[PDB]
């Protein structure tokens, strides 16, 4: 239930795990592509773990 | 006589070493250019200008070698 106001709320169902849509195109470059300093796959795994947990909390 | 037989050999060795040096030097430089461009193509014209700037100094010495090889082959003979 969304805390819309001090005196108003509403129940909602939302898409969680499979990533929902966004409105953008690729940003080519800013600073450094940390990605391949450690393994990309494992770090992305950890990051998405954090993402789901934060949404739930 | 023996002079020309050895002078063609001298020009040959000089220009062969010049060829090896120039070719492989530009090879090394261009590889990094291409990889970096694949990561982010917005820099391609910029890095290609940098590429000529550096490639001139790469070809500095080998064309001294080539000029003197051509001189030995066609003028000393």
């Amino acid at each position: 239930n969304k805390f819309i106001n001090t005196m108003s709320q509403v129940p909602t169902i939302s898409q969680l795990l499979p990533l929902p849509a966004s409105d953008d195109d690729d940003l080519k470059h800013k600073s450094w592509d940390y990605l391949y300093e450690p393994d990309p796959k494992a770090l992305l795994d950890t990051l998405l773990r954090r993402y789901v947990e934060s949404q739930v909390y | 006589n023996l002079n020309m037989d050895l002078l063609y050999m001298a020009a040959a060795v000089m220009m062969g070493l010049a060829a090896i040096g120039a070719a492989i030097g530009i090879g090394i430089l261009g590889g990094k250019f291409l990889e970096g461009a694949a990561r982010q193509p917005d820099l391609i014209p910029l890095l290609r200008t940098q590429f000529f700037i550096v490639m001139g100094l790469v070809d500095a010495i080998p064309m001294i070698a080539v000029g003197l090889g051509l001189y030995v082959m066609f003028a000393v003979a």
Side-chain angles (χ1 to χ4, degrees), chain B residues 46-62:
Chain B
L46 177 64
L47 296 176
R48 189 241 296 130
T49 319
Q50 309 313 316
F51 181 75
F52 308 136
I53 298 283
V54 177
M55 181 278 297
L57 303 320
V58 182
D59 292 344
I61 326 298

Side-chain angles (χ1 to χ4, degrees), chain B residues 32-43:
Chain B
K32 295 304 189 304
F33 172 26
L34 287 177
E35 212 288 319
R39 284 144 49 199
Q40 37 163 345
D42 312 40
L43 306 185

Side-chain angles (χ1 to χ4, degrees), chain A:
Chain A
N1 298 270
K2 302 296 291 175
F3 186 80
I4 292 195
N5 245 354
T6 306
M7 73 296 286
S8 191
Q9 298 91 39
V10 73
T12 61
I13 303 186
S14 187
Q15 174 161 344
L16 178 63
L17 200 164
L19 200 75
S22 177
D23 53 344
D24 255 328
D25 184 21
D26 167 63
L27 317 95
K28 292 283 177 300
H29 42 232
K30 274 261 179 194
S31 324
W32 338 104
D33 63 347
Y34 280 13
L35 242 197
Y36 300 82
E37 293 202 355
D39 167 32
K41 191 67 62 69
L43 271 290
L44 180 62
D45 222 3
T46 313
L47 176 60
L48 297 201
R49 207 152 206 80
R50 295 300 167 273
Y51 165 74
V52 170
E53 284 169 25
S54 183
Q55 206 79 331
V56 170
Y57 192 62

Side-chain angles (χ1 to χ4, degrees), chain B residues 1-73:
Chain B
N1 74 339
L2 62 80
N3 298 144
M4 303 202 187
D5 313 313
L6 265 291
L7 293 169
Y8 282 103
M9 178 77 250
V13 63
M14 183 151 47
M15 293 197 272
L17 306 165
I20 300 172
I24 305 178
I26 318 156
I28 310 149
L29 178 67
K32 295 304 189 304
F33 172 26
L34 287 177
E35 212 288 319
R39 284 144 49 199
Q40 37 163 345
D42 312 40
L43 306 185
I44 291 162
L46 177 64
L47 296 176
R48 189 241 296 130
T49 319
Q50 309 313 316
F51 181 75
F52 308 136
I53 298 283
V54 177
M55 181 278 297
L57 303 320
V58 182
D59 292 344
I61 326 298
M63 306 195 78
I64 314 164
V66 171
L68 305 166
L70 298 163
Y71 173 85
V72 170
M73 191 151 67

